[PDB]
């Protein structure tokens, strides 16, 4: 039985929660808090451990960007720190290939990163790899065909619809087809053999459109939109469905989780989170 | 019969309040709202007018740091906009010398100023002076011996315990003995021939410790702590005692108002504010 973990987030301030949802039995577990709260962190799972990556600690009396890699062991219910990245990365995006975590972009004060770096858990070590062609924060990242896709984001000046793509063997980036919509702060995942970009923010409004990419065709095409507009949402994939958790809709911070069945191209409200929030990290183990 | 004014502040949202405490009769006055709400502004009285400088407006419509200089006449109960500063300054520090308003440091977005500028109320004009040795936001400013003292703060990377000192005749900044604690957003004031620093935030906890500086001794000795830990507290002096107002204690936004008596090295709670808040501007008429 697999769990949907959500870590951190932000409501009034950056938060320390680690909670898991069991999609089959519908229950929420409250697990050990993060030592340092963050929002706009990124989550992933590699060999049984859950990792919280980057983010920023927005407190009422100060912000500080995180460079931290934090490592949660579900069997011990314990967090503990791992070697940190070369720089702090707020509104980071993350993807895993062959058991190595790739940290792509994000902000550090005024820097909007285009650098990316790769954590080897066997060595507890980070090394940098080729930077993207574009500075992106609030980026979406997905792995497809052992390639890393970096979708949308914000470059310090323009919100993006461009998307580029990384070749681990060759260590080079290439732009790919741009999206129909400008999307900073979207949720991005792969499901079956396509990359989905859900919600986000286009410069005027938060979105509920979902468009999806196809390497065969090399185009983005929309699918059923979500019930709730949302930006800075969490996203993961479980069984054969997309799960979006949380986000800011322009007015309130959502507790809504939406599930997307592609067989039927419809979204439904499955569970709600124990409290609304934005900018979670999400992963499945 | 003189008054302690408190302006703006923050609770869930930047605030508009202008209220005034009467330390003799123990009563609170509700005066005209500010026109834009603001937290992290500073206040000063020069010329029987009250001035509200800079700050930030956190509304659910967005963020915007202020370069405003707003000016309240207490015989008319009216705020009027005066000339704005060169540059927005959130978590600003202010001190008056010879009826001229020094706006020290502060932040604008990602930028952490060391710029300083001096308002002339007569001409209604702002001009820059020698910028300080250290980027400082959340800085406490005190005026002692016709010199301008910038205590602690945050420089965009670390919180600070360094203090430095402006020489207006000479137009230059020299550094002074650093504090024992690092404090961003403390309350800094002058009492007797002492520069006091109470409270603050060291990127980690809130503070209840209080130290004073002694230009003859050139050292920073500790004195009695406050009952409550306060960061982004409002401070002022009246009839030979220090008054600290509200702040964040890490958990709630304090309405507590404490009063330090230097004769007995003790604090005591005088009246609470009407609603708890932090990041207020405070002046005495």
């Amino acid at each position: 039985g697999r769990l949907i973990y959500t870590a951190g987030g932000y409501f009034r301030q950056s938060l320390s929660y680690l909670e898991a949802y069991n999609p089959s039995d519908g229950t929420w577990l409250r697990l050990a808090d993060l030592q340092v709260p963050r929002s706009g962190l990124a989550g992933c799972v590699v060999g049984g451990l859950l990792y919280a990556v980057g983010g920023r600690n927005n407190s009422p009396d100060g912000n500080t960007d995180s460079s931290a890699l934090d490592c949660y062991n579900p069997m011990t219910n314990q967090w503990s720190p791992c070697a940190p990245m070369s720089v702090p990365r707020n509104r980071i995006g993350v993807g895993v290939i062959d058991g190595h975590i790739y940290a792509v972009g994000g902000s550090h004060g005024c820097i909007h990163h285009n650098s990316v770096e790769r954590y080897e858990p066997e060595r507890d070590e980070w090394h940098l790899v080729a930077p993207m062609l574009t500075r992106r924060i609030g980026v979406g990242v997905a792995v497809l065909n052992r390639l890393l896709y970096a979708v949308g984001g914000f470059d310090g000046t323009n919100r993006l619809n461009s998307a580029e793509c990384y070749y681990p063997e060759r260590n080079e980036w290439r732009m790919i087809t741009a999206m129909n919509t400008i999307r900073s702060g979207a949720g991005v995942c792969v499901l079956h053999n396509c990359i989905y970009a859900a919600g986000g923010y286009d410069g005027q409004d938060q979105l509920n459109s979902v468009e999806r990419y196809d390497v065969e065709t090399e185009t983005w095409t929309f699918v059923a939109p979500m019930k709730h507009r949302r930006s800075a949402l969490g996203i993961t994939v479980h069984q054969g469905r997309i799960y979006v958790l949380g986000g800011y809709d322009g007015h309130t911070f959502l507790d809504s989780v939406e599930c997307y069945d592609p067989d039927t191209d419809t979204w439904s409200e499955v569970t709600r989170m124990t409290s609304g929030r934005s900018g979670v990290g999400v992963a499945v183990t | 019969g003189r008054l302690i004014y408190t302006a703006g502040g923050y609770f869930r949202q930047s605030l508009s309040y202008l209220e005034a405490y009467n330390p003799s009769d123990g009563t609170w006055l509700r005066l005209a709202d500010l026109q834009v709400p603001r937290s992290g502004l500073a206040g000063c009285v020069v010329g029987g007018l009250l001035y509200a400088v800079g700050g930030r407006n956190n509304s659910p419509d967005g963020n915007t740091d202020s370069s405003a200089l707003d000016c309240y006449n207490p015989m008319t109960n009216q705020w009027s906009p005066c000339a704005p500063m060169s540059v927005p300054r959130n978590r600003i520090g202010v001190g008056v010398i010879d009826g001229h308003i020094y706006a020290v440091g502060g932040s604008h977005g990602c930028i952490h100023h060391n710029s300083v500028e001096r308002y002339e109320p007569e001409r209604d004009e702002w001009h820059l002076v020698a910028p300080m040795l250290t980027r400082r936001i959340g800085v406490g400013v005190a005026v002692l011996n016709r010199l301008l003292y910038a205590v602690g703060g945050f420089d965009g990377t670390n919180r600070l315990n360094s203090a430095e000192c402006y020489y207006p005749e000479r137009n230059e900044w020299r550094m002074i003995t650093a504090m024992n604690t690092i404090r961003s957003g403390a309350g800094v004031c002058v009492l007797h021939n002492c520069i006091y620093a109470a409270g603050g935030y060291d990127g980690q906890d809130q503070l209840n410790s209080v130290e004073r500086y002694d230009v003859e001794t050139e050292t920073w000795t500790f004195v009695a702590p406050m009952k409550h830990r306060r960061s982004a507290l409002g401070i002022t002096v009246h009839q030979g005692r220090i008054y600290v107002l509200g702040g964040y204690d890490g958990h709630t936004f304090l309405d507590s108002v404490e009063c330090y008596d230097p004769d007995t090295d003790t604090w005591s709670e005088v009246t609470r504010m009407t609603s708890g808040r932090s990041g207020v501007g405070v002046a005495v008429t």
């Binding site: 929002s39 609030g138 914000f154 702060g185 923010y201 800075a232 911070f253 | 963020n63």
Partner: peptide, 7 residues
């Protein structure tokens, strides 16, 4: 704040 609502 418009993409994430933070302050």
């Amino acid at each position: 704040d418009e993409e994430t609502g933070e302050f």
